[PDB]
Amino acid sequence: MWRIWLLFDPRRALVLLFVFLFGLAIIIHFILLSTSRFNWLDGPRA
Amino acid sequence: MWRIWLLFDPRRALVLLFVFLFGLAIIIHFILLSTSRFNWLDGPRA
Amino acid sequence: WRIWLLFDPRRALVLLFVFLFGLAIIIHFILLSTSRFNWLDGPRA
Amino acid sequence: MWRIWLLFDPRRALVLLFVFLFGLAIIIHFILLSTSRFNWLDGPRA
Amino acid sequence: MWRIWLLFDPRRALVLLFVFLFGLAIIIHFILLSTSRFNWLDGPRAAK
Amino acid sequence: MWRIWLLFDPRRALVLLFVFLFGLAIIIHFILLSTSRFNWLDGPRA
Amino acid sequence: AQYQNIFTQVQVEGPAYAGVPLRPGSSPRETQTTFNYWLGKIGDAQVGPVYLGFTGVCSLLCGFVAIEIIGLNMLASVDWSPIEFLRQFCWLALEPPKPEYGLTIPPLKEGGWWLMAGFFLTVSIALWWVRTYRRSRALGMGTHVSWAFASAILLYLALGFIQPLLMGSWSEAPPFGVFPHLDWTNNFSIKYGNLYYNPFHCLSIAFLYGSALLFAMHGATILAVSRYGGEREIEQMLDRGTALERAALFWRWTMGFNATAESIHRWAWWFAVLCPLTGAIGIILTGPVVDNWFDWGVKHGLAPPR
Amino acid sequence: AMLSFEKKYRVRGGTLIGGDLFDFWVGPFYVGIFGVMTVFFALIGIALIAWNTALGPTWNLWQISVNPPDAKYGLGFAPLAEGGIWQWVSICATGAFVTWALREVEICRKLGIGFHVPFAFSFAIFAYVTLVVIRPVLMGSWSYGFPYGIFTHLDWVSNTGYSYGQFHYNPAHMIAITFFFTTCLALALHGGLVLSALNPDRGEPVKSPEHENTVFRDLVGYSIGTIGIHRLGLFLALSAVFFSAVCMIISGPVLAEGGSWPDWWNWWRNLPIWNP
Amino acid sequence: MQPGAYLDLAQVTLYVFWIFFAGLLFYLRREDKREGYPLVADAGSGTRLAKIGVPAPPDPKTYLLRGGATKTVPSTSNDRPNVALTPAAPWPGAPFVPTGNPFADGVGPGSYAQRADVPELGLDNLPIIVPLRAAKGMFLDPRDPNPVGMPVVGCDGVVGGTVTEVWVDRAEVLARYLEVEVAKSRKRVLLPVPFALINDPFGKVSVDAIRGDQFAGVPTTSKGDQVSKLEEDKICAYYGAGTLYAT
Amino acid sequence: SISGLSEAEAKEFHSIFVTSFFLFIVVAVVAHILAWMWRPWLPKATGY
Amino acid sequence: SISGLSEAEAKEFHSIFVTSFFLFIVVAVVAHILAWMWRPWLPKATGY
Amino acid sequence: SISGLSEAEAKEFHSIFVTSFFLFIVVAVVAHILAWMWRPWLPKATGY
Amino acid sequence: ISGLSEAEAKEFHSIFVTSFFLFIVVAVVAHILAWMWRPWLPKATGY
Amino acid sequence: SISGLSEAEAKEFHSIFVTSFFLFIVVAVVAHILAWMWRPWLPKATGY
Amino acid sequence: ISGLSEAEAKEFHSIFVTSFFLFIVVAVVAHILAWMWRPWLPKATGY
Ligand code: BCL
Ligand code: BCL
Ligand code: BCL
Ligand SMILES: CC[C@H]1c2cc3[nH]c4c(c3C)C(=O)[C@H](C(=O)OC)c4c3nc(cc4[nH]c(cc(n2)[C@@H]1C)c(C(C)=O)c4C)[C@@H](C)[C@@H]3CCC(=O)OC/C=C(\C)CCC[C@@H](C)CCC[C@@H](C)CCCC(C)C
Ligand SMILES: COC1=C(OC)C(=O)C(C/C=C(/C)CC/C=C(\C)CC/C=C(\C)CC/C=C(\C)CC/C=C(\C)CC/C=C(\C)CC/C=C(/C)CC/C=C(\C)CC/C=C(\C)CCC=C(C)C)=C(C)C1=O
Ligand SMILES: COC1=C(OC)C(=O)C(C/C=C(\C)CC/C=C(\C)CC/C=C(\C)CC/C=C(\C)CC/C=C(\C)CC/C=C(\C)CC/C=C(/C)CC/C=C(\C)CC/C=C(\C)CCC=C(C)C)=C(C)C1=O
Ligand SMILES: CC(C)C/C=C/[C@@H](C)C/C=C/[C@@H](C)CCC[C@@H](C)CCCC[C@H](C)CCC[C@@H](C)CCC[C@@H](C)CCCC(C)(C)O
Ligand SMILES: [Fe+3]
């Protein structure tokens, strides 16, 4: 499996991986925060 | 884990890290300040 | 001593100063926008 | 403290300082002129 | 204080200073002329 | 007093000065014409 | 035959180019120059150097005075909160003066800041026009670029200055804002009839469409004959090669008529310049001359009485 | 009938269909089989428009109009006197455009040059097809196409625009307008630059590409080059039309016909960073 | 022009614009005719009077050149009006057929113009199209493939030669030509970059205009370090002929 | 060997990358257990 | 030096410049006196 | 090697980096403890 | 480094100071006149 | 030797940097004490 | 590094510091005057 790095560049791919994961996490967090059940700051909305 | 520094130039890694951390801290502070339970300046609303 | 053999003091100082000024402006404006910490016109309503 | 001038060209540093100070002064004067209490032209509002 | 003229060119500084001064002067005159108390042409606006 | 022309190019100075003078004159004339008291055409508005 | 000329295959890199020596009467340029790998994939990679003198510096200073006025008013309209400023930035504006002040100088919070920002922006734009003229003359070239810029400047002046003058009120002008100025466009069309029935508006739209059509055609033609050396448009006019012959014969066998390596750029210049000219004429006529364009269209048989 | 240098190019070959039967010129025009076909389609369409106008009340040029079928016919075929003429004129126009593009392809093959021009015309054909075929189908009936009238299709444009609140808030519409204005700016710049290099100041020699690079490095600090400006022109002109087609595809088929584009942007105003 | 009359200012302005636009169209169509006129009559037409069309071609135009020379357009000496072609039919509008070899005669898509037999001189009187070995200070941006060493294949998969050099354009930095050494000849020809796909097969250069065995026929340059405009145009036309005659 | 690396450098980077990714996955699993304990998802067809 | 002017040229230009400037100022002052005779400005806080 | 650093520099830079990162983390932990003592989060499905 | 000598530097400085002072004096006189025309800085209740 | 500075110059600059940083933080601490003396923040969930 | 010696930098810094100090003095006087005209920092209820 380690041959992927013989095919891709580590420093050029790891940055895209980090950006991708950060964007995914921020999107999931915002979606959860926008609901009423899983809002963890102000709680549910009556 | 010191290996990463033979591959990544600190003079850009640290800059990216600092800008990203500052942006994240700003975002979290704004989120907290926009609520009413965690507004530490004007206090709760209504 | 910290090893400044990596960061040019010129750029690392001008960016630091611009950043600090921006942060201070932002904090002052945030405070001015509130009614409790407005130090010019005072509380509203 | 005088060592700084070995690192910074006094020309560019001084012109940036002048521009920054003038901009800050203009901003403060504008904010004051925008209020009702510290408006020194036409006085307080009603 | 005379030594400063070894850093800055007199031509550039003297030509930027006049531009800056004229801009400031016209901005101040415009601000004064917008108000009602310091309008020197028509005078105070008719109170409603 | 003549020393100023050792710093400034006379042609450039005259072009700039003439354009500036004409623009300032036309601006002052327009401002005067916009008012009611100093309008020399149709005079005051009633 | 299979390589489309969209992207550069192999990039050549040498020393930076300082530039053609300037005709006497100009300042020296800057020396900072860099190269960009991505800009070289589509075009040229060298960035810089730049020339800044008196006109460029004064233009930038006045433009930034105007931008600062606009931004400080946008911050004051939101109680200086940066959070609420970022929340709704495209909905903020610096409104034009109120209709009850005519062409006088209004109070600051009712049109004075708008007037000062307009004045400084106009001075900035005029200084940039002078800069284009001056930079073109300093190399011995013609002044076609500045006279094309003058048409956009004329449309800008008609929108902001001339039509308010002829209408006798500063309130007829657009605001300084992203969405507010689109709303102003909509309300301007609604207020004076239907702007579709303004014939100079129709001509301006025709010239915008023809500008897009012609620039697509010219780009495609030059890319198609670039294998024979067609992109060197100046040398192909002083010494006609086979690339421009094929380019002319394509359009001659297609639509009956063709141009030369130079006259097509005159077609380009004129179709681009005629859009803001006809637009400015149509804007100047709207209000001062005609106040309902649909009634005008009905009078001249453009539409049934409806 | 030939230019002074044209004779060495009028060789035989390079067709797609028909062999050497239609491989001739009529004046300056090359014919091919697609030339015959496109002139045929154009003439049938013009005769149909004229016949539809004879059945109408006026011969006024600005008031001629071929109206699409009524909504009660769905996506079927309408009677000729009550909507079918619009459908047949649409068919004829599509045929004329496709045959024009194919004739351009044949001319490109005969001359030995790239196929960029027919490829770029395909974008305008795609926008027309999106306006008269794709969007009416996704909406449900042919009654959604625009009329063939000089001043009635402008009324169609305005009614369609006001059917979605204010059409200015359509984001693809905003991107397309930006691309159109940038295309105009770049065309003016390129034309003026080439003209000023070929017609210099009084008493000067004709300039060179180095002067052209220098003038824009002195104006704005960057110059794109001679091949870059043509690439960018094609790119901008095609992106404008692509995004206008996208703009019209999402209006109606995606956003409902009674909705508002201004209210879409509220997704930005309700972000939890600042919403409460 | 009074209020209530039919005539009003807007339509007067519109008609003024219509007249101006007719004038501008005439001026533009007049400028369009500075090359290729008068026309060459077809078969079965009179040749006693010239055909020019209704917007008459304007007077010849003179351009001042850098060294002090002049250039008068139209360029009538670039036309090559007598070539090896025969008409395929006696009626007007008929195509022509090459009587000999279209690769060597310069007809059809392989047609070139009679340009000046000198190199383009650049802003310092030194040729601009130059081999990289004679342009001090320029290199090949190692992020992109290095064609020097790759073999070149024709439209039929046959290898025609190998790449030995890259000819660049000074003052417009770009790779314009590749120098190709033919397989079994030790001779050098030029290949225009827009005609080649560098690295289409991983280590090769693909040219789908001519067959691999036709590189031997590409025209050559007089000097090994510069190329004239006529030679450039001939080298481009040779590859252009293969688009229709390579079979 | 077209990425500019050797085999040994590739193996080094791959080992470190695998261990880091694994630690990330373990922390994420613990976070999901805690999140489910705080408030569960996947309701029934009638609702919560 | 900066201007590339002989000192004699500088003094010549200065003389003619000052003459023109003084004539301009004189005629402007006459214009302002006539304008004040027509209508004064600078009213009081209540108006004219 | 590729980043332009030798082994010794890389290792000592890693050491100082980890130390500073650890100080940042412990300060953040203290800040979060204090924040919870001021205002707790993670309510119940019925609220606080 | 400005391309200036020292004597001419001091001369420029002298003339600059004199003209700066003249400007300042004229401005102060204008401000005295302006204040005796209309005072600024009102009271917290107004003029 | 990457930055372009020596190793003693680095020590000097860092010493001055630390002194300035510390002075800044001291002034900021005094500012915050005064600001709290003017208006306290961090209210209780009931309010102020 | 910038283009200055070790002594000219000294005298430039001296002049810079004197100018900065006098500017600060003028600003302090202006602030005393402004507080005497219209104070700020009100109480939680207002002025
Ligand atoms: C209360 C109002 C009074 C009045 C009170 C005053 C007072 C007070 C003064 C004047 C002065 C002037 N008045 Mg008056 N004046 C009045 C009405 C007029 C009318 C009119 C038709 O109503 C006109 C034409 C004038 C004209 C004049 C000028 C003679 C003079 C302005 C000097 C100047 O312009 O410097 C311009 C000098 C130059 C060298 C400009 C050169 C031109 C440049 C080089 C070219 C620019 C190109 C340009 C941008 C191209 C586009 C221009 C457009 C095509 C127009 N007045 C009314 C009756 N007037 C002033 C004066 O007397 O000064 C001598 C003055 O102090
Ligand atoms: C509902 C709204 C109305 C409508 C209302 C208007 C109004 C009002 C106007 C137009 C105008 C135009 N309309 Mg319309 N228009 C409508 C429908 C259309 C449709 C369509 C398919 O429906 C199209 C294609 C168009 C297209 C057009 C163009 C033909 C024309 C714009 C020319 C231009 O390039 O200006 C863009 C160029 C400029 C504005 C000049 C640029 C100025 C300078 C050069 C820029 C300086 C920038 C500065 C340095 C940046 C810093 C500044 C600070 C940041 C602030 N309209 C409908 C019917 N339209 C304009 C016109 O002229 O028509 C008569 C115009 O005023
Ligand atoms: C109230 C109305 C709304 C509005 C409602 C609409 C509606 C509805 C539409 C647009 C569309 C457009 N609008 Mg809008 N739009 C408004 C305001 C504007 C303004 C402005 C300044 O306010 C501008 C610049 C625009 C600009 C635009 C463009 C993005 C777009 C038009 C280009 C296009 O479609 O290419 C497409 C080009 C073609 C389709 C050309 C086809 C070419 C064919 C193949 C060739 C034909 C040849 C012919 C038959 C034969 C000729 C031969 C002769 C011999 C010569 N709109 C107002 C606010 N707008 C249109 C769009 O985006 O559609 C894609 C559209 O449908
Ligand atoms: C033929 C008509 C079309 C047209 C033409 C046109 N525009 C032009 C020109 C021409 C021929 C120029 O020569 C001039 C230019 O410099 O182009 C590169 C320009 C220009 N058209 C511009 C914008 C513009 N044109 C528009 C439209 C159009 N321009 C028409 C469609 C629009 C629209 C649709 O709204 C805009 C926004 C500018 C990019 C430029 C004029 C710049 C100017 O006046 O700057 C004033 C300075 C300020 C406001 C100060 C703030 C700085 C920036 C916000 C301004 C931009 C500066 C940047 C362009 C250069 C900076 C370089 C630095 C190294 C200093
Ligand atoms: C309280 O409010 C305010 C704001 O907050 C709301 C602001 O934020 C700001 C702006 C400041 C900032 C905070 C941003 C930072 C910017 C700076 C630090 C710069 C400071 C700028 C100023 C103080 C003023 C700027 C003024 C300038 C640059 C010059 C202004 C000149 C004019 C207005 C021209 C006068 C008008 C005329 C003559 C009309 C004529 C008509 C024309 C349009 C043409 C004009 C052309 C010329 C006169 C020049 C021609 C030259 C030629 C031909 C070239 C000759 C050859 C040469 C090479 C010389 C301020 C000042 C402000 O107060
Ligand atoms: C608005 O008005 C109206 C018209 O609209 C102008 C209409 O028409 C019609 C009538 C139309 C219909 C009843 C059906 C309409 C349905 C659709 C448009 C839905 C979308 C359909 C598609 C996604 C495919 C569209 C294809 C169609 C319908 C073309 C019609 C085909 C024929 C008439 C048969 C003859 C074949 C032709 C002309 C083209 C066939 C269609 C293709 C898609 C071909 C695909 C091509 C390739 C895959 C590559 C081709 C390769 C080539 C050329 C080889 C080259 C050589 C090599 C060796 C490389 C009505 C009522 C109408 O009111
Ligand atoms: C008395 C006479 C003598 C004076 C009059 C002289 C005349 C001549 C004046 C005529 C004026 C006319 C001609 C102009 C009319 C203008 C219209 C034509 C066009 C309107 C512009 C439309 C744009 C979309 C504006 C958007 C700008 C805004 C979004 C940018 C805000 C910037 C902020 C964010 C600044 C960053 C934040 C901080 C705080 C750091 O700054
Ligand atoms: Fe071109």
Side-chain angles (χ1 to χ4, degrees), chain H residues 106-185:
Chain H
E106 261 174 351
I107 294 164
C108 291
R109 266 160 62 99
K110 187 181 300 284
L111 277 157
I113 62 179
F115 299 98
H116 304 68
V117 179
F119 180 82
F121 188 32
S122 296
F123 276 72
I125 300 168
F126 171 73
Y128 168 76
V129 164
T130 299
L131 279 180
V132 307
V133 166
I134 301 170
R135 182 175 185 264
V137 159
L138 295 165
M139 294 286 270
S141 59
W142 298 121
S143 65
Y144 277 101
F146 62 93
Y148 300 145
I150 291 179
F151 275 97
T152 56
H153 77 309
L154 300 202
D155 304 328
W156 178 89
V157 172
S158 67
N159 295 152
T160 306
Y162 285 119
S163 294
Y164 298 92
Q166 188 180 333
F167 207 76
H168 270 158
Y169 287 75
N170 190 326
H173 183 244
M174 282 150 47
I175 302 165
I177 293 188
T178 311
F179 274 119
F180 263 107
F181 286 163
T182 315
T183 308
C184 199
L185 201 153

Side-chain angles (χ1 to χ4, degrees), chain G residues 1-3 5 8-15 17 20-21 37 41 43-44 199-200 203 207 226-229 231-232 235-243 245-246 252 256-260 262-264 266-267 270-271 274 278 281 285 289-290 293 296 299-301, chain I residues 5-6 8-11 13-14 17-18 20-21 24-25 27-29 31-32 35 37 39 61 63 65 71 73 75 78-79 109 111-113 115-116 120 123 137-141 143-145 147 168 173-176 193-198 208 229 232-233 236 240:
Chain G
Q2 196 181 0
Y3 171 63
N5 208 336
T8 300
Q9 282 162 126
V10 294
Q11 300 192 207
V12 179
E13 179 64 27
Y17 187 41
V20 174
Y37 181 73
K41 279 271 194 176
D44 213 317
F200 283 96
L203 290 161
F207 284 121
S226 65
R227 52 177 75 169
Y228 305 105
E231 68 286 346
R232 318 186 223 170
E235 195 64 24
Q236 286 283 340
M237 188 71 202
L238 308 175
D239 201 15
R240 197 195 60 241
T242 188
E245 293 180 358
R246 295 161 202 253
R252 184 159 186 90
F257 63 107
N258 60 281
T260 44
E262 166 176 353
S263 51
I264 188 55
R266 298 198 184 276
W267 283 92
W270 272 109
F271 282 180
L274 278 183
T278 42
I281 295 170
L285 292 172
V289 182
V290 175
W293 279 113
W296 191 88
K299 173 187 177 187
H300 295 277
Chain I
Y6 187 79
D8 46 43
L9 177 51
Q11 69 156 301
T13 310
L14 186 59
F17 174 79
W18 281 136
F20 166 74
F21 190 53
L24 181 69
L25 285 174
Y27 165 80
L28 287 168
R29 285 298 294 144
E31 287 301 281
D32 274 353
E35 283 279 0
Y37 283 86
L39 304 177
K61 187 190 186 181
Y63 293 89
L65 300 186
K71 174 65 191 193
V73 303
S75 301
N78 290 53
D79 292 355
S111 180
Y112 59 95
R115 306 185 78 186
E120 191 167 339
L123 195 62
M138 332 194 72
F139 42 100
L140 271 190
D141 190 296
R143 258 168 297 194
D144 291 338
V168 305
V173 302
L174 288 174
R176 281 223 190 278
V193 159
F195 268 123
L197 261 169
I198 292 92
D208 67 327
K229 280 172 287 183
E232 273 181 289
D233 203 72
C236 287

